[PDB]
Symmetry: C2
């Protein structure tokens, strides 16, 4: 309804130490905006609950599904569709991301 | 349906010299992914045809609607809803963006 600005500070990531955070900052549905943070050398595998358009801001991720792996560095986007099982691996400098999720 | 990666190179921006490009790189609807490029010191005003979630990658934009202005630098997101009239102003180093649009 109204213009809105978001920044990574809205994710208060210092409150959630650990190997990985993905925290929503807005619901625009719901179409949700968030930011993520991956510690160096972290791998996890998840079946996507929702369609996710992720952009790497800093560092680097590899994303794998089926028989196919891509790597995403700063400015690069990976679309991860609902129901696909993906492995996300952060590299030696970790990663920061932004993302948008949406429903069917 | 399948995982996909996009990068700013997919927008072939060298083909579109000028003061501003916003070029789609994928349709995921349609939910569309794109990248933008603004020359230094460029202002334009548009009524949004679609809801647009924009992230600044490099440089800086100011975005104004109604009585309110925000500025977005690298990593910062501006949501611009359908039907709102927005003025986008790029600063002295121009700007690069990524964005996602979607319909009602």
């Amino acid at each position: 309804m109204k213009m809105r600005k978001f920044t990574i500070a809205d994710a208060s990531l210092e409150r959630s130490p650990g190997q990985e955070a993905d925290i929503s900052v807005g619901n625009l549905g719901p179409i949700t905006i968030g930011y993520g943070r991956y510690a160096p050398g972290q791998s996890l595998t998840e079946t996507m609950a929702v369609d996710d358009v992720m952009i790497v801001l800093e560092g680097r991720l590899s994303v794998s599904t089926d028989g196919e792996t891509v790597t995403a560095g700063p400015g690069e986007i990976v679309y991860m569709p609902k129901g696909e099982t993906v492995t996300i691996r952060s590299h030696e400098e970790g990663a920061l991301t932004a993302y948008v999720t949406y429903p069917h």
